[PDB]
């Protein structure tokens with residue numbers, strides 16, 4: 002009953018039918034059921050959890066965590082602490098095994114949650130075949146009809162192809178292939194210095210690869226990142242041995258007879274042609290919304306120029322009982338963003354108000370040092386004509402950072418001059434990912450820099466750097482710098 | 483020859499050195515007196531800093547020497563400890579941070595006087611240096627920040643040789659074969675875990691029935707203890723120590739008994755760590771002559787502006803009432819001097835977090851279940867295990883849980899308790915929430931980054947508020 006796979010083709014009735022089981026979809030489904038809706042979730046893949054769990058957040062963070070420790074052991078760090086070891090060697094198969102084990106546990110967990118919450122799991126490819134009907138096509142060619150009051154589209158995203166370069170997940174890989182390489186490549190080129198590219202590039206660099214990232218734009222870290230932070234982040238990555246060719250376009254790539262790959266590059270403006278060679282080519286220039294064979298055209302739901310499904314503030318499409326959330330709509334393509342849209346969408350179905358402020362959605366980069374931010378950047382505030390003041394504190398002056406001998410980076414706070422209201426928080430260094438959530442909480446209340454400065458932060462913690470940066474923004478000076 | 487000052491601070495610990503810096507920033511002509519060779523007080527020289535350094539290093543030693551690194555494909559033939567080098571890393575951090583305080587004094591034009599300060603007048607402090615020389619400071623206000631010392635155990639003499647305090651324990655020259663810890667408070671658990679990791683056979687003896695000191699939630703404490711025992715950390719709770727004898731062969735015989743009575747036995751060790759507590763330090767400060775009396779526990783009584791009975795003489799930090807913690811002393815120092823300048827003075831000890839930097843970490847802020855029951859407060863509970871958290875699972879580090887206590891009428895968060903990875907950093911999000919008077923629903927609806935440990939804090943709140951979490 003709760004699983005409808007091949008062979009199960011009796012028509013189903015539902016209040017809410019969710020197409021896709023990624024962060025957006027599976028949370029939306031669970032919450033809908035918790036709200037009392039008779040809920041169905043359709044997923045075409047063999048496991049639940051979507052991009053994030055299966056080929057995304059989870060496997061990438063696993064390799065980042067493991068490769069960092071490998072670097073700590075293989076390099077100078079452990080030695081400096083009195084931990085002496087004759088021969089540190091990499092066992093990639095074992096490392097990959099740890100990653101796969103985490104993915105499997107968490108995928109299995111979602112299935113248990115569906116079952117615990119009485120969510121009907123339909124395994125097949127969903128297509129909307131009426132304003133109140135979805136048809137699922139299963140692996141054996143069977144079909145199953147779901148008559149449903151509301152439809153929630155959460156069909157997610159796919160890798161953006163590069164014209165003339167064919168991804169084969171052999172020597173020319175996407176992020177998916179890069180997460181499962183069978184050996185450390187001697188030399189790797191990364192097309193795209195966004196978050197995904199920097200993370201995967203750093204991983205293989207740690208494990209011994211000679212890595213170069215090529216980026217068309219003039220900075221690293223994707224859209225919205227504060228420029229000062231991005232520049233400082235880059236300089237740090239470069240000192241680690243991570244090379245960058247910014248303001249550069251790739252004109253093509255050729256797989257040679259000897260197995261290597263020749264990448265042809267040029268200045269983005271034009272000029273200065275040259276070729277660079279590698280063993281593995283990682284193509285990650287972006288991701289785009291996925292809606293293939295969903296039945297949108299027949300319904301008359303037109304996509305925007307970038308392939309997104311247009312929705313209103315209640316996440317309704319142009320057909321009022323059909324909704325869309327997550328990577329398939331506008332906004333930051335992030336897991337927690339998809340999740341929050343899913344929750345409030347179904348809360349709206351149940352009659353509640355629906356509001357989300359994308360300015361309060363944090364971004365994190367899980368390199369070492371980490372990068373994290375929430376709210377506005379300096380570029381944004383200038384663009385919007387907002388008058389602000391700046392507070393900074395370096396981690397070199399933080400007691401927990403100094404003690405751990407892990408002291409790259411800084412916290413930067415942006416406050417409004419008139420009211421001292423916190424407008425943006427930008428963290429480069431250890432613990433950025435956890436710390437930005439303290440800032441997100443502050444933004445929710447419209448807290449001041451003084452507010453945070455006067456909160457008793459535990460000593461010694463990395464969070465004290467956040468306290469001190471706010472104090473500097475508010476009072477003009479910190480205590481410890 | 484005498485110095486004139488607006489504010490004279492006696493002691494350079496977290497309370498004193500921050501108070502001095504701030505006073506100078508506020509425009510007060512400021513002097514700080516320190517009797518020790520370096521600045522930074524207990525926390526920097528023999529406290530927080532050296533202890534966290536050894537906790538960090540011994541944790542990584544355990545990861546390399548044990549199973550963890552192997553499971554992640556990080557293979558190592560023979561991992562060995564170089565204790566002299568590990569101690570060196572510790573000392574290097576202490577030295578860098580003590581020096582940093584000296585630079586901060588200079589940067590903010592704080593005058594540093596080296597000697598033993600004694601109050602010699604309502605408006606005068608005299609510092610006597612080691613060679614007997616004196617430096618007199620005539621001053622408008624006096625800020626007492628003289629901190630704390632170790633509480634001795636009666637009948638047992640500490641010599642920092644085989645019977646050590648926390649100071650001696652932080653600098654042992656070799657891993658003791660067998661070590662006994664008197665006191666299972668925070669300091670005792672932290673130092674014991676360090677040496678257990680480095681190869682010592684460690685047993686902690688505690689008179690009370692739980693570990694982690696006062697104020698810790700009982701459920702949390704019991705779960706913390708069980709995890710520590712599986713690591714190999716042994717405990718004798720509800721046990722009293724009756725004495726210890728320094729033997730001829732250099733070893734130590736500790737006599738113990740059931741706390742209620744009726745189970746005498748003796749156990750032997752190579753090193754005995756005595757950490758049953760700390761107490762306020764005010765020795766030879768000139769208080770008696772002034773008529774400033776101490777309370778029964780040795781603290782200086784102060785009012786809401788931290789004034790003693792003599793209104794221009796103040797006291798903050800470990801020498802007064804409240805939690806004996808570094809960040810507490812720091813905040814008291816700041817608001818004390820803000821008050822001198824005429825401003826408001828506020829600290830809420832219910833919003834002061836506590837952290838234990840073992841692995842797993844422990845952290846809490848606000849009220850425990852035992853406190854809420856004592857006070858007759860009706861509350862609801864929300865829990866979320868790190869086993870169901872995505873970042874914890876991805877890192878393969880899944881011990882423990884977050885527990886949120888909320889009041890039923892208003893959904894106000896009353897207490898947060900964290901056992902597991904990242905607890906120390908995470909409690910600061912919780913401190914902000916309590917200071918703002920957050921509801922459990924508030925936190926549940928804040929967008930936390932995925933995947934992060936903080937999501938367990940979000941989910942625990944959702945459970946307290948809505949009754950159910952999403953991922954558990």
Ligand SMILES: Cc1cc2nc3c(=O)[nH]c(=O)nc-3n(C[C@H](O)[C@H](O)[C@H](O)COP(=O)(O)OP(=O)(O)OC[C@H]3O[C@@H](n4cnc5c(N)ncnc54)[C@H](O)[C@@H]3O)c2cc1C
Pocket residue numbers: 020021022023024025026043044045046050051052053054056057058059061125126127128155156157158176197291294295326327328329334335336337338339932933
């Ligand atoms: C390497 C990589 C690392 C990343 N790291 C992070 C990170 O650290 N933090 C973060 O926030 N984000 C991260 N992301 C982004 C995150 O994965 C996405 O934002 C998120 O997965 C989008 O959630 P979703 O529910 O909208 O879509 P998806 O996760 O893409 O899920 C869509 C689901 O719908 C299925 N589906 C599609 N169409 C149909 C159909 N017609 N019928 C049935 N099923 C269908 C798909 O099979 C898929 O499972 C990362 C992404 C990548 C590639």
Ligand SMILES: Cc1cc2nc3c(=O)[nH]c(=O)nc-3n(C[C@H](O)[C@H](O)[C@H](O)COP(=O)(O)OP(=O)(O)OC[C@H]3O[C@@H](n4cnc5c(N)ncnc54)[C@H](O)[C@@H]3O)c2cc1C
Pocket residue numbers: 460461492493494495496497498515516517518522523524525526528529530531533597598599600627628629630631648669763765766767798799800801806807808809810811
């Ligand atoms: C092993 C250990 C670990 C700890 N870990 C932590 C932790 O992780 N987090 C936390 O918050 N707290 C921790 N603490 C507690 C912390 O050290 C204290 O709460 C804090 O140091 C108190 O600050 P203070 O300014 O009030 O006093 P103190 O730090 O004790 O400084 C007092 C200063 O005054 C000097 N002095 C005293 N009398 C005079 C005099 N008459 N004239 C001149 N100078 C004088 C003293 O030499 C000293 O330097 C730990 C303590 C110990 C022992």
